[PDB]
Design a protein around this ligand. Structure first.
Ligand SMILES: O=S(=O)(NC(=S)S)c1ccccc1
Lengths: 1724, 261
């Protein structure tokens, strides 16, 4: 490392561009010769020289090629010689390759071969191809080339079904085709910007083949881009261990060995070198080097030599001249034609009176070009950019028709299409490059391509190429075109910028990372091979043979450059790079560092449009732009009337650039050609630069500058100003009609609501007004209403309802439209919040609900403002004021209850033996909060509330009341409700081990199974349950005597009433108060929570006295709490995480050097990546293994059972990570290692903040945002998650302190502070979630009329908050009539939504009753909208697959998906599973649910996360299928109900209806059931029939396996069924009939249903169904369990005097193959 | 003279005035308010800083701009009057007087607040209230009786060097009569005398915040299109913030014309 030295990169740059001539001489081929003619020296090269064949070369017919790739090579048979040499390495090896072949020669066919190899990899059995699985990247140097590449690649590869396309325009939203495309052709810089932005879940992961065409561009000044890409790809391959193939194509140039080293191409296997001999046609070479130094004479001489050469080819095939500009094609064609007219030589091109001249005359009127009709008849033609594509194709067709005898073209033709000519002449090799501010020589690639266009496939025996240029540059153009031009790196010029690109990516984060990165660059290779050219002394090279010191010095210089410009914070000692927002913006908009420093210095919030134009003008991309004399007059004529003022004089090029931009926006044509070129440069570059200024000033919250910059972006794009009538933006509207509209000063606004004829009268052109109307309504516009939700006296939550008020036409609006939402302060200076809003076509009509938080203060600011501005559509702006005239602000938080300095309460205060015993085993004194509250819980019967930080010991407080209840009666029942099940299990373990093990009391954790839970509540003294498990039970409180006999109700984390699941908590808690009032026996209520600012509201809601409610403050936490909030301001999430990487290490070594540390990260991938980052920073800054505290070998036993080698290594170094995908044993082992202190740091996913049982001294929360795959957007951590994560910093019996660092975006800092230092207000969301509760209460008759519904709502927390914060619930007033009217509206709306959903029935618009759909809803605890969709979809239609689809699309499953493109893989196998239908909406929850379900039925092996998904889906599944059975029985037909029962049993045993029943037997392989079916025996109890010796002979199984099988054979239900008809012969048609069925279990075993593949435990169930299959009519259904024996009777109204069968009753709900049927018949 | 180099190259005046007005945000931190300290009237006016900073940021140094003032009295103190809103109306101005519509502002928000007068810019800090200002205030008083002479003021924001000095005036009855009778626009016209006005107390504050109301259809700067301004024109208002002086919406011609050639 130190000491280093700073280099002058400017001096190290060759400053020759691609014109660097590293060769010192130039040898010529034998036969060549040199002449001198008229002042120009002519060099002649014979070329020719095609070696017939080597040792043994035989061309390969396509028939010998692999079958899969033959069809792509349609229309050809014999590959060229190079192709036949490379067929092996291209289609039979996966090696990276570099092919140096002469230009032309079809070097792209080998790339096609490699592409076909990678295509054949992903071919599946169906004949189709896993198109979604792979992506190939093709890198062409010119967009001209890219378009033809896309076309031809699609044409040749359409047969395999690949969508071949290039990506264009803005990459922000055009990503649908990106997923759709399988081959992506693009320019190197577009790929660079893409990979720069990057991201996770990108398609860059699926990229397996990259093809770098025309790679000799490495010599060009664009070369460093190719270098950056290849270095990036190799480094990322190394990191991913996923090898990616690189295929390089170059010309016959030296230094090819170093280029192969660049591409990791093995010389023997991968390197294939061919010379110019393998050119398709011999290229007779003439090089003309002129010496005349007068410009006028040079022009005349160049025209003279061109004329001489064209006349030497007067009768020859064709002549193709190339010139620099578009007007110069016309000039040169006109010059040669006029020189032909001065002579009589013109007649030599024409074939006398030709039919071809007749064709050129035929298209004289058809060409519709001013130059073309003048020059086409004489055989002349031109090709340039400013030309119709049809006209260009017509010129190409006449040249292919051989009619056009002379063609003059810009290089765009040379790159674009396949247009060969016999003779090709390059008229000059100098061209104006607006970047350089000068005329520079031609890029070697352009020259190589043009002169490769000389000769033709078969029409010519030989081609001839003439190159006219200066005499000095002759040698260079010789050595390039005869293989003596070395290829060198130009990275030194661009090194700082490139480095920033990699720092922003995080790929580089220290100087040594950058030295590695540079090692993968072509610059390093070339420095190692030729140190002389790159300024490295030979003894200097001896000093460090690997060039470590030189690379490190280069990196140090670049880092110092970036730190100067404030892009990157660089630490000299460490060598560390910290990315900043400026550096990211520079990398992400292709801005160089000097430009960004300029922007940072100049840009102030008070800039005007004048100053903003100047700031753009001072961009370092325009540094070489100069004001020349030849143009100053025109520039002065413009600057005299520019709309945006220009302060400086016209001599300063700043003024030139400013004026040129203004002229581009005003759409002006300039006379000077240098002006046209410099405008092209300035404007094409201006887009990204202005977007960069936009993100700067926006993320800086400067409102005015943000507006101006966005509008300037829209103006640069749409080529108009604001004042212009925006209709011109359509591009389908005439210009003159818009002019006539502009003349009228009636605001376009004022023609919105106007009808067509009035519009026409206003324009004065009425007939077309309808069209205007259409294009008036196609103009985007939105409608915004605002719901203000006061959170606190300082914080407001805002719900914006965006409703589209335009018509969506895909021809105009595309797939999506984009808007920016900006909240602005009173004086429109400060952007309080901004947000990007994408209106997609899927919801182009529907409303859009956006909720955000804005601060406020007292006295109230008059208004805020909400502007919505279209990102691309101009003047499409809709602004909404937000007035606080009528804002009702909540009362201030009451002072918290004081924590008195009371004497610590010993355990002896319980005054009971076993109580004292346990709590002396654990401690000698009580927590001070426990101490303060002890008397009220232990020595009173009142309801009590406790509020204190998470980690204060609230559980012991509740245990006190449990103990007092047990003392008052040892048979009493307590119900403990906690909102999270993963916390319920912690409570269950601890409280079983306590109460049950030490007191012979009962502790039962409810399961959700109705009968299991009712038993557990009957037998239990302490019943732990989640809210929903208690809701479903307590609903039937009238029919449940156990629910009424409850004595104590404890509820933990009650603040979670303000969360997503809050409503069910609030509902059960109000249910307990209503029940305690009704039964007159008091049910005591104990509530534990975090500190609540409005704790008194909840206490009153629960009947807690003022003396019983205890609300504390986060300073009273037993363990003292140190909180630090660190703001990171990068808007880009991923880069923000990178910026937070190293400060995690810093916070560890500052706050918790030796004590344990827990880090919380937003996603599972971030767990492992942050662990690796911790270990890397630790290795670099001090020493690793500061985390390990147990000997590595003492942990190797525990370690070797783990699955992830990454996890075992990081654990070895002392850091473990927790994510959903870890198997339970792995998670248990990591948490065990953490509690043991063996591992110091644990990096854990956010989702585990409830599940984790461990704790640490320090808690480091990263980011506080997570990606949603559903919305495809980031969501904030709710405050409750944050509180729990912070509560993890509670180590009581080990640490004196508890420290937590929350790393958040700057904007959130305040909010977090505001709501983490002080108690938290909570409010009810029950007003939204209410329909299912109302329907259930209508079922259980708790609610009978609408007045009873309002009565019901009186008991809620909602009522308490509505009088305290009305605006939060959209109320306006605290009076009693306001409340009654609001409740009236709410009850009417909920009940009418119920009635229309058919769950209830409203009579006289007053009284309500429950229908059967509502009964099936409340019975099975199912959302009513599920029931509605079920009722509408089922009908009499019976499909097992359709049934799975109906169940999946139920509203309950709208959860779980994230990333998981492996569903695609499942989709492939879901193409195999019985149902592949519906369009493949991956990322849709219901799709994932039925996919996982159908995988489960086929006993398919999936991932672990997918298995958890499966578990939850399965539980809610069986309850839904029972609902479906009851629906199909209530009024449906017979076959669908029967199929639903079959689906229930199919789900239980993970069996398909076709599978053999023997698949239910444990330890039974598929070969085993094949053996049994070879016996033909398939009956499930046939195994029971065989003797155990005989069954043992057939099975060949292990005694434990046979024991499991025997338990199942015994548990398998075999029942005796008896059917009977009372009074059978004496029945009546009108009268009812009862059929009696008696069922008796023969075995009479007790236990659950044996289904290991089923998640929860389940009991036997059975169905009985009267109904004929001939008529598909179900008559009489009844379900029942068969414990012991039982009789059942089915009532059914008889038909009319007709014979009928006695049907197919018996059906199961679990075991498959137990289904019976008995038939009979009797008439009336 | 034989063959002498001759060509006129010049720019319009509004170019220079725009380049000048771009730096108006600077004068906002140095804003002084003049108090003779002998007024002792009783009626005290409190002007919030935000609306004044936006008023100054949008003005021009040469051409004058004006805004109407609406405000109420604080809860307990009738003697105090807190300017709480500035209404910008379509106007066109010269360096002496500002031409305003005959229609006074009318909106729902303004129904609860009192018309407290008007405020206008001034390029020179003349030590007396302009005769044009007296005439305009008296004519506005006579045509609309919503402006009581004792509760309406003329606030003058004078463009002092690198700053802006405020001073507030109220008309006296003789001033009302002379301003109703005056049809002369001279700088020292008939019957002008300093006893026609009196100095009232103005206060700058940042304790409370004020808001702007701008016309809903067109903006306020008709200066660049003085033709479209007729004193009998009628406007509707909205809750928004006023655009800068040289905003493109104020001068559409300067863009369209430059586009046509
Ligand atoms: O109830 S919230 O409005 N959450 C949703 S968006 S469901 C809320 C309020 C305060 C802190 C965290 C969360």
């Amino acid at each position: 490392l130190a000491p280093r030295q700073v280099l002058d990169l400017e001096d190290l740059v060759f400053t020759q561009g691609s014109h660097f001539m590293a060769n010192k001489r130039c040898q010529l081929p034998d036969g060549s010769f040199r002449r001198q003619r008229k002042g120009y020296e002519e060099v002649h090269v014979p070329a020719l020289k095609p070696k017939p064949f080597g040792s043994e070369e035989q061309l390969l017919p396509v028939e010998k090629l692999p079958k899969y790739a033959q069809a792509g090579f349609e229309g050809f048979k014999t590959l060229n010689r190079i192709q036949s040499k490379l067929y092996r390495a291209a289609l039979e090896t996966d090696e990276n390759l570099l092919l140096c072949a002469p230009t032309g020669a079809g070097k792209t066919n080998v790339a096609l071969m490699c592409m076909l190899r990678e295509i054949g990899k992903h071919i599946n059995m169906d004949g189709t191809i896993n198109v979604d699985d792979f992506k190939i990247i093709y890198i062409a140097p010119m967009r001209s080339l890219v378009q033809e590449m896309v076309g031809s690649f699609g044409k040749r590869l359409a047969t395999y079904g690949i969508t071949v396309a290039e990506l264009t325009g803005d990459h922000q939203l055009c990503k649908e085709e990106i997923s759709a495309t399988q081959i992506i052709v693009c320019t190197p810089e577009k790929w660079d910007i893409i990979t720069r932005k990057g991201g996770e879940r990108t398609y860059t992961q699926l990229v397996r083949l990259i093809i770098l065409d025309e790679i000799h561009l490495l010599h060009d000044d664009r070369g460093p881009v190719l270098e950056a890409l290849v270095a990036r790809a190799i480094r990322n391959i190394e990191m991913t261990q996923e090898d990616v193939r690189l295929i390089g194509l170059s010309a016959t140039l030296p230094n090819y060995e170093d280029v192969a080293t660049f591409l990791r191409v093995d010389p023997a296997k991968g390197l294939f070198y061919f010379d110019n001999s393998f050119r398709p046609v011999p290229l007779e070479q003439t090089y003309v080097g002129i010496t005349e130094k007068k410009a006028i004479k040079r022009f005349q001489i160049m025209n003279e030599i061109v004329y001489e050469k064209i006349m030497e080819h007067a009768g020859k095939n064709q002549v193709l001249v190339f010139v620099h500009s578009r007007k110069e094609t016309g000039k040169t064609a006109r010059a040669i034609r006029d020189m032909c007219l001065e002579k009589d030589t013109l007649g030599l091109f024409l074939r006398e009176g030709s039919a071809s001249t007749e064709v050129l005359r035929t298209e004289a009127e058809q060409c519709k070009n001013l130059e073309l009709k003048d020059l086409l008849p004489y055989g002349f033609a031109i090709h340039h950019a400013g030309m119709t594509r049809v006209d260009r194709t017509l010129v190409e067709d006449l040249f292919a028709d051989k009619h056009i005898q002379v063609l003059v073209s810009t290089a765009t033709l040379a790159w674009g299409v396949n247009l060969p000519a016999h003779t090709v002449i390059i008229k000059g090799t100098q061209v104006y490059s607006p970047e350089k501010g000068r005329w520079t020589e031609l890029g070697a690639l352009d020259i190589l391509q043009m002169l490769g266009r000389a000769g033709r496939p078969q029409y010519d025996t030989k081609g001839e190429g003439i190159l006219i240029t200066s005499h000095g540059e002759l040698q260079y153009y010789l050595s390039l075109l005869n293989q003596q031009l070395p290829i060198e790196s130009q990275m030194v010029s661009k090194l700082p910028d490139m480095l920033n690109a990699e720092i922003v990516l995080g790929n580089v984060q220290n100087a040594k990372d950058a030295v590695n990165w540079l090692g993968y660059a072509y610059l390093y290779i070339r420095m190692l091979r030729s140190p002389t050219l790159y300024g490295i002394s030979h003894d200097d090279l001896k000093g460090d043979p690997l060039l470590d010191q030189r690379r490190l010095d280069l990196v140090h210089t670049a880092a110092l450059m970036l730190d100067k410009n404030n892009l990157v914070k660089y630490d000299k000692k460490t060598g560390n790079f910290q990315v900043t927002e400026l550096g990211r913006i520079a990398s992400h908009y292709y801005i160089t560092n000097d430009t960004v420093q300029t922007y940072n210095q100049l840009l102030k919030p008070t800039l005007s449009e004048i100053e903003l134009f100047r700031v753009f003008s001072l961009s370092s991309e325009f540094k070489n732009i100069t004001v020349r004399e030849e143009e100053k007059l025109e520039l002065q004529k413009l600057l005299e009337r520019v709309p945006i003022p220009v302060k400086e004089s016209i001599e300063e090029p700043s003024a030139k650039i400013n004026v040129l931009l203004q002229a581009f926006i005003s759409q002006l044509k300039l006379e000077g050609f240098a002006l046209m070129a410099d405008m092209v440069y300035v404007t094409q570059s201006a887009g990204r630069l202005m977007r960069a200024i936009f993100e700067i000033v926006l993320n800086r919250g400067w409102a005015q500058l943000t507006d101006k910059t966005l509008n300037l972006c829209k103006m640069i794009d749409k080529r108009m100003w604001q004042s212009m009538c925006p209709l011109r933006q359509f591009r389908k509207l005439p210009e003159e009609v818009v002019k006539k509209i502009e003349k009228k000063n009636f605001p376009f606004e004022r023609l919105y609501d106007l009808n067509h004829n009035e519009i026409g009268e206003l324009i004065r052109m009425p007939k077309m007004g309808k069209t205007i109307h259409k294009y008036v309504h196609l103009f985007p516009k939105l409608e915004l209403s605002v719901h203000l939700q006061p959170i606190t006296r300082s914080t407001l939550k805002v719900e914006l309802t965006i409703t589209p008020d335009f018509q969506w036409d895909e021809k105009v609006h595309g797939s999506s439209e984009a808007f920016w939402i900006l909240v602005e302060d009173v004086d429109s200076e400060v952007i309080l919040h901004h947000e990007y809003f994408l209106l997609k076509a899927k919801y182009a009509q529907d409303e859009h609900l956006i909720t955000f938080f804005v601060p406020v203060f007292e006295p109230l600011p008059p208004q805020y403002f909400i502007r919505v501005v279209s990102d691309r559509w101009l003047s499409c702006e809709t602004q909404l004021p937000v007035s606080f005239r009528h804002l009702i602000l909540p009362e201030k938080y009451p002072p918290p209850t004081e924590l008195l300095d009371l004497q610590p309460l010993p355990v002896s205060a319980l005054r009971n033996s076993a109580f004292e015993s346990l709590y002396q085993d654990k401690f000698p004194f009580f927590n001070p909060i426990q101490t303060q509250v002890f008397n009220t819980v232990y020595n009173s019967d009142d309801n009590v509330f406790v509020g204190a930080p998470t980690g204060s010991g609230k559980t012991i407080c509740a245990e006190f009341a449990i103990l007092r209840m047990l003392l008052q009666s040892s048979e009493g029942r307590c119900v403990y409700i906690t909102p999270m099940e993963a916390l319920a299990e912690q409570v269950y373990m601890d409280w079983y081990e306590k109460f049950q093990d030490r007191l012979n009391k009962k502790v039962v954790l409810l399961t959700g199974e109705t009968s299991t839970d009712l038993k557990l509540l009957g037998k239990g003294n302490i019943i732990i349950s989640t809210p929903e498990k208690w809701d479903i039970l307590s609903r039937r409180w009238k029919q449940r005597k156990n629910v009424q006999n409850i004595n104590l109700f404890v509820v933990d984390e009650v603040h979670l009433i303000g969360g997503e699941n809050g409503p069910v908590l609030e509902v059960i808690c109000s249910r307990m108060r209503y029940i305690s009032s009704q039964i007159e026996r008091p049910i005591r209520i104990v509530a534990l929570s975090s500190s609540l600012s409005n704790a008194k509201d909840v206490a009153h809601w629960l009947g807690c006295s003022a003396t019983s409610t205890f609300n504390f403050h986060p300073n009273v936490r037993p363990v003292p709490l140190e909180l630090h909030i660190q703001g990171f301001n990068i808007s880009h999430t991923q880069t923000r995480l990178l910026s937070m990487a190293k400060p995690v290490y810093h916070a560890i070594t500052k706050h918790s050097p030796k004590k344990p540390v827990i880090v919380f990260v937003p996603s599972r991938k971030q767990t492992r990546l942050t662990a690796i980052d911790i270990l890397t920073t630790c290795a670099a800054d001090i020493q690793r293994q500061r985390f390990l505290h147990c000997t590595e070998k003492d942990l190797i036993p525990y370690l070797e059972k783990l699955s992830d080698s990454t996890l075992k290594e990081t654990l070895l170094n002392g850091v473990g990570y927790l994510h959903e995908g870890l198997s339970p044993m792995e998670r248990r082992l990591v948490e065990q290692l953490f509690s043991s202190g063996a591992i110091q740091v644990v990096v854990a996913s956010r989702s585990l903040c409830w599940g984790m049982n461990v704790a640490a001294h320090l808690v480091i929360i990263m980011d506080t945002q997570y990606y949603n795959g559903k919305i495809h957007a980031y969501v904030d951590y709710p405050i409750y998650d944050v509180l729990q994560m912070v509560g993890h910093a509670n180590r009581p019996l080990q640490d004196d302190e508890g420290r937590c660092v929350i790393m958040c975006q700057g904007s959130k800092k305040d909010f977090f502070k505001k709501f983490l230092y002080e108690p938290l207000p909570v409010e009810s969301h029950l007003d939204h979630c209410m329909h299912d509760h109302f329907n259930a209460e209508i079922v259980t008759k708790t609610i009978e009329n609408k007045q009873d519904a309002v009565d019901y709502l009186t008991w809620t927390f909602l009522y308490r908050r509505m009088t305290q914060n009305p605006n939060y619930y959209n109320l306006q007033g605290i009076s009693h009539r306001h409340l009654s009217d609001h409740l009236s509206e709410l009850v009417e709306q909920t009940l009418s939504d119920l009635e229309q959903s058919k769950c209830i029935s409203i009579e006289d618009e007053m009284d309500v009753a429950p229908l059967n759909l509502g009964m099936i809803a409340a019975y099975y605890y199912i959302n009513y909208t599920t029931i509605e969709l079920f009722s509408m979809s089922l009908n009499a239609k019976t499909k097992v697959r359709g049934l799975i689809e109906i169940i999946s699309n139920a509203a309950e499953y709208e959860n779980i998906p994230i990333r998981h493109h492996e569903d695609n893989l499942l989709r492939q196998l879901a193409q195999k599973v019985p149902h592949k239908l519906n369009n493949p909406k991956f990322n849709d929850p219901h799709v994932k649910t039925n996919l996982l379900l159908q995988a489960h039925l086929s006993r398919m092996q999936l991932s672990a996360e997918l298995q958890s998904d499966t578990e939850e889906i399965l539980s809610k599944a069986i309850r839904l299928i029972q609902a479906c059975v009851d629906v199909l029985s209530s009024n449906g037909w017979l076959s669908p109900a029967l199929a639903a029962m079959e689906l229930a049993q199919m789900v239980t045993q993970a069996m398909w209806s076709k599978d053999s029943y023997l698949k239910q037997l444990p330890h039974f392989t598929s070969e085993h059931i094949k053996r049994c079916t070879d016996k033909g025996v398939e009956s499930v109890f046939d195994i029971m029939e065989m003797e155990d010796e005989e069954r043992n002979a057939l099975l060949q199984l292990t005694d434990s396996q046979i024991a499991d099988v025997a338990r199942f054979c015994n548990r398998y239900p075999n029942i005796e069924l008896s059917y009977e008809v009372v009074d059978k012969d004496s029945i009546r048609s009108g009268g009812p009939v009862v059929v009696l069925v008696q069922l008796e279990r023969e075995e009479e075993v007790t236990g659950p249903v044996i289904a290991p593949l089923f998640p929860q435990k389940r009991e036997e169930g059975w169905w009985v169904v009267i109904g004929d299959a001939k008529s598909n009519s179900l008559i009489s259904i009844k379900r029942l369990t068969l414990q012991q024996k039982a009789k059942v009777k089915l009532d059914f109204v008889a038909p009319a005097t007709g014979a009928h069968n006695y049907t197919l009753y018996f059906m199961s709900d679990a075991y498959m193959g137990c289904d019976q049927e008995y038939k009979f018949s009797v008439d009336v | 003279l034989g063959s002498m180099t001759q060509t006129f190259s010049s720019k319009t005046e509004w170019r220079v005035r725009a380049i000048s007005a771009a730096n108006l945000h600077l004068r906002t931190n140095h804003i002084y308010v003049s108090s003779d300290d002998i007024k002792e009237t009783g009626y005290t006016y409190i002007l919030p800083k935000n609306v004044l900073k936006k008023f100054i940021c949008i003005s021009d140094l040469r051409a004058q701009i004006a805004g109407y003032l609406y405000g109420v009295s604080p809860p307990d103190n009738p003697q105090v009057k807190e300017i709480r809103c500035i209404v910008m109306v379509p106007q066109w101005g010269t360096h002496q007087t500002v031409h305003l519509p005959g229609q006074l502002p009318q909106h729902e928000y303004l129904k609860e607040m009192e018309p407290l007068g008007w405020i206008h810019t001034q390029p020179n800090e003349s030590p007396q209230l302009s005769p044009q200002d007296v005439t305009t205030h008296a004519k506005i008083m006579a045509d609309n009786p919503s402006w009581d002479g004792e509760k309406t003021i003329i606030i003058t924001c004078s463009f002092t060097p690198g700053s802006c000095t405020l001073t507030a005036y109220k008309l006296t009855p003789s001033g009302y009569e002379w301003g109703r009778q005056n049809t002369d626009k001279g700088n020292n016209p008939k019957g002008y005398l300093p006893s026609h006005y009196e100095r009232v107390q103005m206060l700058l504050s940042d304790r409370f915040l004020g808001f702007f109301m701008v016309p809903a259809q067109s903006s306020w700067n008709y200066n660049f299109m003085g033709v479209r301004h007729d004193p009998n024109m009628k406007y509707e208002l909205q809750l928004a913030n006023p655009k800068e002086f040289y905003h493109e919406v104020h001068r559409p011609s300067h863009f369209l014309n430059f586009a046509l050639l």
